[PDB]
Design a protein around this ligand. Structure first.
Ligand SMILES: CCCCCCCCCCCCCCCCCC(=O)OC[C@H](COP(=O)([O-])OCC(O)COP(=O)([O-])OC[C@@H](COC(=O)CCCCCCCCCCCCCCCCC)OC(=O)CCCCCCCCCCCCCCCCC)OC(=O)CCCCCCCCCCCCCCCCC
Ligand SMILES: CCCCCCCC/C=C/CCCCCCCC(=O)OC[C@H](COP(=O)(O)OCCN)OC(=O)CCCCCCC/C=C/CCCCCCCC
Ligand SMILES: CCCCCCCC/C=C/CCCCCCCC(=O)OC[C@H](COP(=O)(O)OCCN)OC(=O)CCCCCCC/C=C/CCCCCCCC
Ligand SMILES: CCCCCCCC/C=C/CCCCCCCC(=O)OC[C@H](COP(=O)(O)OCCN)OC(=O)CCCCCCC/C=C/CCCCCCCC
Ligand SMILES: CCCCCCCC/C=C/CCCCCCCC(=O)OC[C@H](COP(=O)(O)OCCN)OC(=O)CCCCCCC/C=C/CCCCCCCC
Ligand code: HEC
Ligand code: HEC
Ligand code: HEM
Ligand code: HEM
Ligand code: HEM
Ligand code: HEM
Ligand SMILES: O=C1C(=C2CCC(c3ccc(Cl)cc3)CC2)C(O)=C(O)c2ccccc21
Ligand SMILES: O=C1C(O)=C([C@H]2CC[C@H](c3ccc(Cl)cc3)CC2)C(=O)c2ccccc21
Ligand SMILES: O=C1C(O)=C([C@H]2CC[C@H](c3ccc(Cl)cc3)CC2)C(=O)c2ccccc21
Lengths: 239, 81, 378, 378, 239, 81
């Protein structure tokens, strides 16, 4: 059975710790230049990047880079136009049969909730991305599979997707495989759960309040029940 | 039906009470309440706890056994060739 | 007269929760009914809101929930609240049942029977809500639960196909799940009112098991503030579960949409069901398995009939208490076994746990009661 | 005692409809309440079935109804029954109100007020069902009824946009219509039970307007068989309407799907609404129009206050009777005007009919009552 | 305003009269060869013709005549196949913009409920089909409109669609314009309301029953109420 | 509350009844019932009917007037050219 991922010290794992938005910005470049060849992200749109790592104008600029189908026009025909904020990240394949045809029968999953749809979360993915190696003695792989101990079965269709200097970050960070993996993983965390930071923000407040209300109402209860708690009885028959 | 006018028949019982504003809400905690809780734990310990201890032993045993069952047996390859 | 007593609606309210005579000495175990009602109300409200964004169609159900959690303002927390409220609802339900088993309150026959009805209804409701997201676990849960009626010997398969509305699970079945999940909670509400009507004709039992008519106090102000305290505590727990650790009870396999061609290797229902699942797993025969599954709950209806003790409560009955806690551990064991693969150690342990559950309810408790009677010389 | 009287649930049933004392002399006009209840039950059943095939989405609503009427086995007659039952429901409702206006039963204040509440609820429900098919008339009906709140001076437009869930009528509004249409009937049911609870504290008024406690008969068997006869008659009429002449009340413009860019030249709501529409059409001012629209129904609440007569019923009061029938003809006139284009003859006639409606309720009847009193010398 | 259609004596208008299925069979040929060039019938499929005027085999034969898009295939591409019973009558245009482009801005409506969506029903349509003529003096028509008094406005985009011998019926009936119109109208009646015949069938039964139940229950009522209806009172004070 | 034991106080009233199986359900229709219905119609005719007659006149008038209003006036073209 599959190998259990170890726990990495992620800076957002504290009870009130927020995500590192720099790592999100770099992870998103990783997902543009590499991982959006095979994979779809059907539930994210450019308008979602605004106020997270981009202004509205710059997100429009990202959008503009992509052609999108639209129509019908006044003649009843379809056409192509540049993108807008309200368009969803584009799909790599038109249908899953075409996706299988382009990957030797295997279907790459959608990464919009991959971090919440796998045991271990971002610990697993990192483990999977860094974890390829040569197989043991006695093991063999059929046509077009790789070996990876952190996959269930240890045979996986996906070739090692990243290596050192497979891209360059615009902030000058050195692009070693490990750095790339950590950053794309942070970005998938954000893609799976946007409410993260605001949720922790809101916890502080309303937990303080609900904690405060316990002793107060307990005092009120004790006040009303003191009458019975100190009551004294006696029995006085005429005998 | 059931109403505070005619619940039961009682004779010769006297009661005494203070008002809440005359007395304290948490009068004696560490000198009376704590020992009382301690005896209250004592009086029930051996009627509840050992069953759960047995559950814990069973759980750990069954886990260990299942995990042993997944490891390769050397005699399955060494014995005959 | 005061207006409190001037009028039928007002006088019913007064007899219910202002001048009702309650025992002075009942403990925290009696707070869980009001918490149950609170939970029902919470569920109905959060459900009416969710309803206005969900899509009962197999080609958009999943994505409608995605829409709710990503684009609707604070929709994520409304989702979180609904899902965690169900869990709290069952926690309170189990504790509520257990009280009555321990303290002998099943001797209020009408209240007990209406309670059993309510348990059944709530379980149906919870399950029919669990399949609406149309994830990978939801689909196969639906499949199993609707194949259950194939065990009926003469008419079963036809019943299955008449509930499906077709040759297989499909779009016509999801709308049925959604209509039923919409309507059941309100039937639950009405039956809850009947339940309390039956209760108030006798009044509450208490920990000692002896008649409390010499020391009744009014419901207001004492138990009003006590139940308000209980509610505050429940809200603290619910908030911490909703905001600080939302993924504690969550299942990853339901974040993969449904695939009619593949069942995943490791199958596991929602936690409040595991134990039944274990029971269902323990019988090597189809019909017998289903029969055991349903008897496991229906057996509560004959506990009043097997009662031999002169005393009502277990407070003064130690052998009884020992058996009670052993029964609770058997149920924990079934819950644990339900989580594990169907492999040999767990198979054998589950079979023992099941036989001991029925054994204990049907044989051991009656006999210990007789021994106890003999030790007190009556 | 007999079991009839052994138990609270049974004894409430007995006090309701077995040993209840009813007047001996009440007429057919008292059958229409039971028919109302029957209609509510019919509507709930046929609705629960339809619900399992309908689609609350603007891109498939229309076609889901097409699917129901063409492919579902006998779905066409279930549709027919639902639609015609609504019409019967309002027929009975109007006759039920009119009785009480004629025979002075508004002096049972609680029953009367709960009746007004029920009228309002039923109208809301009926309208929110009428927009679900998403035909060409449904769409513009929705539009008008949701723009009504723009008349509130300070907060109105924001209310409109908060009910729409967007910049305009659209997909988010249809699911709201459907959730509300699902939940309201059950609130109606509960309030009906309260209505009857209030009634049974006093008992039924009768045609003569004098106290009937010297000649009470039991409800069973007399009124049981009488109401069963009434139900048989209602079913005969309903079947003939459903099977022999289904298109009598039908509207062709709702067999064209919705087009947000074109309102059709001739606009006409469902018949039980025409009269309000006419009233709304008669005031050349927005706010005043809406105010009149709502006052037209809310005015029933002050009829008990304007009552001057020594006698309760109109049975012995001829001038009164003459005015009553004149009022009924004014309402017929408003219904007829509602059907006609907004052109000059009908504009003028509608304005006169409206002024005469309010005039008659607020002025003429009180004064005729005083004249009558003087003629009998008290 | 529009001219009011007269009432024609249609053989199905009696309370218990059924439709003439021969006229349906001919009307359907009219709708194939002529009227399905412009118009869609989105809510009818070939399986619906079975047991009305065709066997299952012959309806399959009708189906087979038409190509229909299907897929994706195993490569991820669409293809064309012959029709089946469960396919819907084919559309003439891909979208309504294309329909307008092909009819000089006007949009032909769907005829699946045209008979229930117009005042006068099949009286109107017949009137419209037979009713074209030359305009009055003083009247003029803009580019591409015809005159027809039974249209609201009297100007209509649709040119006269039928004439004598515009098709030939397979049963040898002479194809005069009037005959063609009457038959297509019968067919539209059937397309708008399939439950017609069975509905009338069912009325006979359950109306007989509900009519029978009235006097019986009335007798039962009278029986129970005779006690009060013949009661006699007297007043006897000691005086 | 309201119950057949204590509704009101009455003295010196005698009643007589037959059983349903002793008597006829529709004893005399054409010799008694028909004339009674006739007088019952007579006693209410003039309190109900004339209002509806007036409604009918108003309806027909308004229809006729509206339909006249839609016909072309010859003086609209003949008068000045
Ligand atoms: C990041 C998440 C953060 C989460 C933070 C959560 C914070 C929670 C704060 C809660 C504060 C509550 C305050 C309530 C005040 C109410 C006052 C009142 O009136 O109370 C009456 C009520 C009792 O009612 P009663 O009228 O007496 O009736 C009861 C019985 O009938 C009486 O019958 P009896 O008299 O016979 O019984 C006597 C005795 C009976 O004794 C026994 O039966 C024997 C027990 C023996 C135990 C021995 C030790 C253990 C076993 C060892 C055995 C040996 C093992 C050997 C192994 C060998 C292996 C080889 O029982 C007691 O005395 C029990 C007292 C203690 C109650 C503890 C309650 C725990 C609540 C836990 C909540 C968890 C959820 C939180 C939310 C989490 C969200 C993620 O309670 C009390 O009197 C106690 C009040 C104080 C309770 C404090 C609880 C604090 C809990 C903190 C938990 C933090 C960790 C959370 C972890 C979460 C993991 C997911
Ligand atoms: C314009 C901005 C908003 C302004 C809001 C102003 C109101 C603020 C809130 C006021 C709450 C009410 C406080 C006073 C309640 C008085 C109740 C009373 O007198 O009745 C008590 C007496 C008790 O009964 P018995 O026991 O029989 O008495 C016998 C005694 N030996 O009567 C009753 O039974 C209770 C009657 C309750 C009446 C309540 C009336 C409430 C009126 C609310 C008006 C709100 C207006 C809001 C306007 C908003 C803008 C349009
Ligand atoms: C999210 C995951 C949720 C998992 C499931 C959660 C629910 C199950 C929880 C199981 C553990 C519950 C422990 C409760 C505390 C026990 C404390 C204890 O032993 O105290 C004993 C103390 C002794 O008091 P007395 O005898 O009255 O006399 C004292 C006065 N002189 O109190 C009692 O014995 C009271 C017992 C009341 C009933 C408790 C029931 C607990 C379990 C109920 C649920 C079990 C499952 C369902 C059972 C019924 C199935 C048909
Ligand atoms: C196997 C194929 C199906 C076979 C079906 C067989 C049953 C057919 C239908 C039978 C209907 C019932 C008729 C007999 C009812 C007798 C009721 C009775 O005895 O109770 C009357 C008496 C009246 O009360 P008091 O007024 O206090 O009396 C005092 C008198 N001085 O008691 C009551 O209050 C009523 C009690 C009602 C009990 C009804 C029991 C119904 C049993 C139905 C069983 C159906 C089984 C179906 C099996 C289907 C296949 C698995
Ligand atoms: C599908 C299209 C539906 C169209 C709308 C249908 C509903 C409206 C129908 C209007 C016509 C109703 C006619 C009813 C029959 C009238 C018979 C009649 O005049 O009989 C008079 C006869 C006289 O008897 P008494 O005075 O009691 O004394 C006799 C004993 N010695 O009976 C009566 O007067 C009884 C009158 C009872 C009330 C009748 C109410 C009729 C109209 C009600 C609905 C009107 C609209 C709503 C009104 C209220 C609006 C706030
Ligand atoms: C085409 C060369 C791909 C690129 C570029 C990336 N991935 Fe992919 N991935 C691909 C295939 C054909 C598969 C199927 C594997 C199988 O055995 O079926 C996958 C799968 C994944 C998974 C799933 C892991 C699991 O346990 O199911 C993940 C999490 C994944 N891929 C991630 C991922 C990332 C981060 C990439 C960019 C760095 C990436 N993939 C690129 C094909 C291709
Ligand atoms: C293309 C040459 C057409 C053929 C062949 C048929 N119709 Fe048609 N129709 C066409 C157009 C462009 C329009 C729009 C008219 C307009 O003014 O917008 C129509 C319209 C109709 C209507 C609608 C009538 C109404 O009052 O709305 C009907 C009922 C209709 N057409 C029927 C019909 C029939 C029976 C045909 C076959 C004999 C037929 N049409 C053919 C274009 C064309
Ligand atoms: C929706 C589900 C339920 C609701 C809302 C509910 C509600 C309540 C409430 C408010 C009380 C008041 C007393 C108390 O809180 O202890 C109560 C008592 C009671 N309940 Fe229920 N209950 C439910 C389910 C059940 C079930 C499942 C059972 C049994 C199997 C049951 C049996 C009882 C009994 C016996 C009592 C009275 C016992 C006593 O007073 O000693 N109820 N219930
Ligand atoms: C006892 C009352 C109720 C219980 C126990 C209950 C339980 C549940 C559960 C367990 C789920 C699935 C949770 C998940 O998938 O994460 C669910 C979903 C849902 N329920 Fe409720 N529910 C109740 C009342 C209601 C009511 C009254 C409505 C009214 C419409 C409603 C509407 C919904 C909807 C729309 C969903 C799907 C949305 C989603 O999955 O998040 N529920 N319910
Ligand atoms: C769903 C709507 C309603 C239902 C189901 C309903 C039901 C009933 C029933 C069953 C009765 C028994 C006596 C009878 O049938 O006459 C009744 C009486 C009565 N109803 Fe309602 N009703 C409804 C609406 C209304 C409305 C709209 C009004 C007034 C505006 C009203 C006012 C009354 C009054 C005053 C009585 C008693 C009058 C008398 O006994 O003389 N009700 N109702
Ligand atoms: C007082 C009770 C009710 C009234 C007056 C009422 C009225 C109506 C009306 C007038 C329509 C439109 C009819 C048409 O378009 O031909 C409708 C549609 C509908 N109603 Fe009801 N309804 C009631 C109860 C219910 C209930 C309890 C449900 C439960 C789901 C329901 C479900 C539906 C559905 C799904 C539709 C759309 C299907 C269709 O248009 O044929 N209704 N209702
Ligand atoms: O029809 C009723 C009536 C009631 C009979 C039972 C009906 C009913 C409706 C539905 C069900 Cl499931 C059961 C009973 C409701 C109306 C009732 O309470 C009265 O007080 C009354 C008084 C005079 C004339 C008629 C009546
Ligand atoms: O195999 C099962 C299975 O057996 C059940 C079972 C659990 C017990 C349920 C149950 C039925 C009736 C009662 Cl009274 C209680 C629980 C029925 C469904 C599931 O819930 C399930 C969910 C998802 C995938 C597979 C499965
Ligand atoms: O113009 C209108 C219109 O004015 C109403 C009106 C009718 C009266 C309704 C009404 C509102 C409130 C009450 Cl208490 C009663 C009736 C509100 C909608 C419609 O129902 C309608 C339907 C379809 C197309 C256009 C229209």
């Amino acid at each position: 059975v599959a190998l259990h991922p170890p726990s990495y010290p992620w800076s957002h794992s504290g009870f009130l710790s927020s995500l590192d938005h720099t790592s999100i910005r770099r992870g998103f470049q990783v997902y543009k230049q590499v991982c959006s060849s095979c994979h779809s992200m059907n539930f994210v749109a450019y308008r979602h990047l605004v106020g997270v790592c981009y202004t509205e104008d710059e997100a429009k600029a990202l959008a503009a880079e992509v052609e999108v189908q639209d129509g019908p026009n006044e003649n009843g025909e379809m056409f192509m136009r540049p993108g807008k904020l309200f368009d969803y990240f584009p799909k790599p394949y038109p249908n899953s049969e075409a996706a299988r045809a382009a990957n030797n029968g295997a279907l790459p999953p959608d990464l919009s909730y991959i971090a919440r749809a796998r045991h271990g979360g971002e610990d697993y993915i990192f483990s999977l991305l860094t974890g390829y190696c040569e197989p043991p003695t006695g093991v063999s792989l059929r046509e077009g599979l790789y070996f990876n101990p952190y996959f269930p079965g240890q045979a996986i269709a996906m070739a090692p997707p990243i290596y050192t200097d497979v891209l360059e970050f615009d902030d000058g960070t050195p692009a070693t495989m490990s750095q790339i993996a950590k950053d794309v993983c942070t970005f998938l965390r954000w893609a799976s759960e946007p409410e993260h930071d605001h949720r922790k923000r809101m916890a502080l407040k309303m937990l303080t309040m609900m904690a405060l209300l316990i002793p107060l109402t307990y005092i009120m209860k004790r006040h009303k029940w003191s009458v019975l708690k100190s009551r004294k009885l006696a029995y006085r028959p005429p005998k | 039906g059931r109403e505070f006018g005619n619940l039961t028949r009682i004779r010769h019982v006297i009661s005494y009470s203070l008002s809440p504003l005359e007395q304290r809400a948490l009068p004696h905690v560490l000198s009376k309440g704590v020992p009382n809780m301690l005896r209250r734990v004592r009086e029930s310990f051996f009627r509840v706890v050992p069953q759960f201890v047995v559950f814990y032993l069973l759980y750990t045993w069954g886990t260990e056994e299942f995990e042993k069952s997944k490891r390769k047996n050397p005699a399955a390859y060494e014995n005959d060739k | 007269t005061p207006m409190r007593k001037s009028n039928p609606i007002m006088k019913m309210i007064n007899h219910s929760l202002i001048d009702l005579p309650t025992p002075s000495n009942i403990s925290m175990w009696w707070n869980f009914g009001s918490l149950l009602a609170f939970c029902l109300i919470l569920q109905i409200i959060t459900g009416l809101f969710l309803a206005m964004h969900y899509s009962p169609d197999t080609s958009s159900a999943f994505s409608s929930i995605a829409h709710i959690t990503r684009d609707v303002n604070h929709g994520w927390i409304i989702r979180y609240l609904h899902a965690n409220g169900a869990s709290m609802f069952f926690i309170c339900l189990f504790l509520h049942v257990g009280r009555g088993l321990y303290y002998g309150s099943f001797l209020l026959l009408k209240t007990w029977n209406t309670g059993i009805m309510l348990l059944f209804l709530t379980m149906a409701t919870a399950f029919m809500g669990y399949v609406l997201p149309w994830g990978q676990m939801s689909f196969w849960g639906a499949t199993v639960i609707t194949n259950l009626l194939s065990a009926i010997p003469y008419i079963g398969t036809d019943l299955v196909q008449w509930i499906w509305g077709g040759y297989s699970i499909g779009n016509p079945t999801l709308s049925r799940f959604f209509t039923l999940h919409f309507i059941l909670p309100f039937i639950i509400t009405a039956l809850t009112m009947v339940h309390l009507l039956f209760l108030h004709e006798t009044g509450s039992n208490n920990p000692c098991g002896i008649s409390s008519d010499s020391d009744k106090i009014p419901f207001h102000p004492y138990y009003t503030i006590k139940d308000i305290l209980g509610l505050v505590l429940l809200l603290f727990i619910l908030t911490t579960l909703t905001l600080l650790s939302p993924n504690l009870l969550n299942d990853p396999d339901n974040y993969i949409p449904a695939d009619p061609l593949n069942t995943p290797p490791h199958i596991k229902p929602e936690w409040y069901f595991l134990f039944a699942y274990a029971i269902l797993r323990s019988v090597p025969n189809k019909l017998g398995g289903v029969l055991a599954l349903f008897l496991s709950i229906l057996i509560l209806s004959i506990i009043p009939t097997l009662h031999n003790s002169k005393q009502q409560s277990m407070m003064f009955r130690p052998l009884s208490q020992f058996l009670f806690w052993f029964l609770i551990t058997t149920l924990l064991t079934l819950t644990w076994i339900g989580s594990q693969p169907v492999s040999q150690p767990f198979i054998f342990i589950g079979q023992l746990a099941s036989t001991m559950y029925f054994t204990t309810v049907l044989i051991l408790m009656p006999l210990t009661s007789l021994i106890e009677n003999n030790l007190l010389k009556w």
